[PDB]
Amino acid sequence: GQKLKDWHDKEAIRRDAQRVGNGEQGRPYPMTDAERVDQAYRENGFNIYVSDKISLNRSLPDIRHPNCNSKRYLETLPNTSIIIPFHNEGWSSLLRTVHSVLNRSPPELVAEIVLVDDFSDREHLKKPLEDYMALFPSVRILRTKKREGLIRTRMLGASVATGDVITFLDSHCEANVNWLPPLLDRIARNRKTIVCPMIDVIDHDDFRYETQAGDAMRGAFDWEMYYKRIPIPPELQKADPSDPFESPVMAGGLFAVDRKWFWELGGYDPGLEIWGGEQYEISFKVWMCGGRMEDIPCSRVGHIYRKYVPYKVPAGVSLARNLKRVAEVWMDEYAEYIYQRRPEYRHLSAGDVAVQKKLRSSLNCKSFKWFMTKIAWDLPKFYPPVEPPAAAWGEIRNVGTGLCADTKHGALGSPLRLEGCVRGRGEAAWNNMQVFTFTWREDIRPGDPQHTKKFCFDAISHTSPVTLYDCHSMKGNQLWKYRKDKTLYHPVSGSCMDCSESDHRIFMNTCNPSSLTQQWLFEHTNSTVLEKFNRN
Numbered sequence: 001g002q003k004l005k006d007w008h009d010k011e012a013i014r015r016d017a018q019r020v021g022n023g024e025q026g027r028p029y030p031m032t033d034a035e036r037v038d039q040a041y042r043e044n045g046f047n048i049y050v051s052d053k054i055s056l057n058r059s060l061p062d063i064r065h066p067n068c069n070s071k072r073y074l075e076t077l078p079n080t081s082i083i084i085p086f087h088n089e090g091w092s093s094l095l096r097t098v099h100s101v102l103n104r105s106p107p108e109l110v111a112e113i114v115l116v117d118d119f120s121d122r123e124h125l126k127k128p129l130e131d132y133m134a135l136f137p138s139v140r141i142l143r144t145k146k147r148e149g150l151i152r153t154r155m156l157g158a159s160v161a162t163g164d165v166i167t168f169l170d171s172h173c174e175a176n177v178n179w180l181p182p183l184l185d186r187i188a189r190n191r192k193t194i195v196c197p198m199i200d201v202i203d204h205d206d207f208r209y210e211t212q213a214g215d216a217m218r219g220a221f222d223w224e225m226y227y228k229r230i231p232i233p234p235e236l237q238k239a240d241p242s243d244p245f246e247s248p249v250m251a252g253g254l255f256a257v258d259r260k261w262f263w264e265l266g267g268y269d270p271g272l273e274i275w276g277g278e279q280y281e282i283s284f285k286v287w288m289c290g291g292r293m294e295d296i297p298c299s300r301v302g303h304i305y306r307k308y309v310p311y312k313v314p315a316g317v318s319l320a321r322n323l324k325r326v327a328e329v330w331m332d333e334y335a336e337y338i339y340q341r342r343p344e345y346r347h348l349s350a351g352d353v354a355v356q357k358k359l360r361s362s363l364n365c366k367s368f369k370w371f372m373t374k375i376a377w378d379l380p381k382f383y384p385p386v387e388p389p390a391a392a393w394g395e396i397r398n399v400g401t402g403l404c405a406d407t408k409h410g411a412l413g414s415p416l417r418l419e420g421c422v423r424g425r426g427e428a429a430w431n432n433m434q435v436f437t438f439t440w441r442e443d444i445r446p447g448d449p450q451h452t453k454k455f456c457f458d459a460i461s462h463t464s465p466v467t468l469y470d471c472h473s474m475k476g477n478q479l480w481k482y483r484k485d486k487t488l489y490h491p492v493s494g495s496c497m498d499c500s501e502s503d504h505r506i507f508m509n510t511c512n513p514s515s516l517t518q519q520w521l522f523e524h525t526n527s528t529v530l531e532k533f534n535r536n
């Protein structure tokens with residue numbers, strides 16, 4: 001008995017496609033001064049004024065892969081308990097999340113929808129929410145007795161679920177067309193596989209719906225434990241780009257997992273606080289202890305990434321203590337790589353992690369070395385546990401004008417001006433930043449090679465100036481080369497770096513070896529590194 005089935009509710013797709021109105025089809029909302037106010041963000045970190053003006057049943061673009069519409073899945077699948085943790089979430093944003101589930105999910109595959117109130121103090125989340133959800137049979141509200149935080153809140157929900165697999169979602173998401181079956185099917189085939197849908201963006205301003213940059217990518221992180229996304233290496237890339245693909249680390253709130261398998265792993269470290277950490281612990285657990293983690297390209301859910309965090313966090317809580325707890329129990333020797341960047345994580349009491357450590361042994365999991373080597377082998381490529389030395393660092397002095405490269409500390413995107421060399425002898429009042437580093441990544445960022453900033457030398461046109469745009473280990477507009485001719489050749493622009501003898505900014509122009517306004521000289525260097533990525 002393994003009969004397939006097409007779960008595409010076509011009629012729906014049609015009626016949703018013929019829907020009209022603001023925000024419809026995922027388009028940006030017609031902003032007006034009335035919605036641009038600073039008070040429209042104060043409660044959620046995202047524009048609640050706009051959300052209120054958008055339909056709780058709005059329609060979304062089907063930005064799936066062309067193949068996804070043609071897939072079919074097991075006629076019979078295990079039911080799921082969709083669990084949603086919330087804390088002072090906005091009325092319209094939360095309602096929309098649920099509607100999207102009640103309308104885009106096959107009722108039969110939905111055992112129950114449990115909203116879990118994490119001690120919210122907002123009035124609309126009390127009686128009104130109750131009366132509103134009462135009209136919806138499958139929906140159920142379960143509150144906590146005190147502020148637990150997202151981890152414990154998700155645990156409470158998971159401890160009451162009755163469905164075959166547990167699905168977690170944030171309280172400000174919008175599931176797209178036919179998302180649930182592809183997550184359930186995959187688990188029906190492999191009970192120990194955790195599945196994560198493609199997480200799309202919902203603009204915290206105009207609410208347009210759209211895929212994140214680079215779309216389908218692999219999860220990972222830097223050594224300060226900030227979640228990161230990196231390209232799927234070619235050797236791992238699947239034949240059919242719409243098929244499930246392994247991922248090292250999950251994003252965090254959007255994922256499904258078999259209920260038994262979940263608890264078999266011990267769920268989350270109850271010691272984790274309000275936010276952050278549970279995504280790494282759960283991620284290392286599935287892998288190191290026999291399971292697997294996969295992204296289902298055919299399954300997409302929108303999520304509103306906050307502009308800032310509104311809720312308050314209890315005193316005596318630190319993201320650090322969480323990470324440290326995870327670092328001790330699963331990362332082994334690699335934890336030391338976290339401390340080298342953040343020393344305070346050494347003499348920082350990570351509470352009692354004895355119980356968890358005991359869970360790790362009772363599971364017979366592999367070492368963290370195994371994880372990094374077989375599952376996350378590409379992460380060290382962009383985030384090496386130890387970074388290669390730099391090529392050149394210090395002050396960039398232009399031979400032509402004799403002046404030094406400077407920056408009025410305009411990290412938002414200010415041009416790369418040119419001022420008189422300070423050398424650290426100048427008055428620290430003229431906001432002078434004449435220190436730079438040609439990092440191993442082949443990019444140029446401000447600051448000492450030990451304390452660089454996440455801003456790189458970004459240059460578009462082979463004539464445009466040079467700005468400081470957010471970096472990214474993707475040799476493009478931030479790819480530079482320092483040649484024997486003392487120039488900063490920009491291959492992606494075919495031009496070189498040139499300044500103005502009329503005391504202005506710096507701009508791109510035709511390369512000219514025998515010149516001066518394009519000849520620069522760093523203070524310190526390591527030819528051994530320069531001699532590297534200089535050849536084709």
Ligand SMILES: *[C@@H]1O[C@H](CO)[C@@H](O[C@@H]2O[C@H](CO)[C@@H](O)[C@H](O)[C@H]2NC(C)=O)[C@H](O)[C@H]1NC(C)=O
Binds near residue numbers: 056057102136
């Ligand atoms: C928006 O969504 C709500 C809830 O999903 C829709 O109301 C439900 O409609 C279904 C359709 O058969 C009924 O089974 C439910 O009983 C309805 N719920 C309630 C409590 O009335 C609502 O009709 C949708 N509105 C739009 C714009 O289509």
Ligand SMILES: O=c1ccn([C@@H]2O[C@H](COP(=O)(O)OP(=O)(O)O)[C@@H](O)[C@H]2O)c(=O)[nH]1
Binds near residue numbers: 170
């Ligand atoms: O103390 C908290 C903080 C957050 N949340 C909820 O947990 C989910 C994930 O948190 P959040 O969205 O703030 O994290 P983010 O996606 O921004 O990283 C959301 O549904 C929140 O409402 C919670 O229940 N308790």
Ligand SMILES: CC(=O)N[C@@H]1[C@@H](O)[C@@H](O)[C@@H](CO)O[C@H]1O
Binds near residue numbers: 227252253254276279
């Ligand atoms: C969109 C998404 O997955 N957000 C998650 C959030 O829900 C939470 O799990 C956090 C760790 O506390 O990590 C984030 O990446």
Ligand SMILES: *[C@@H]1O[C@H](CO)[C@@H](O)[C@H](O)[C@H]1NC(C)=O
Binds near residue numbers: 078079111162163164
């Ligand atoms: C399906 O969902 C129901 C309702 O939560 C649950 O009782 C049952 O154990 C699940 N599994 C079956 C029998 O399909």
Ligand SMILES: *[C@@H]1O[C@H](CO)[C@@H](O)[C@H](O)[C@H]1NC(C)=O
Binds near residue numbers: 389390
């Ligand atoms: C780059 O120069 C540094 C000196 O600062 C040296 O330690 C390093 O070995 C050189 N690059 C390599 C790894 O060959």
Ligand SMILES: [Mn+2]
Binds near residue numbers: 304
């Ligand atoms: Mn969220």
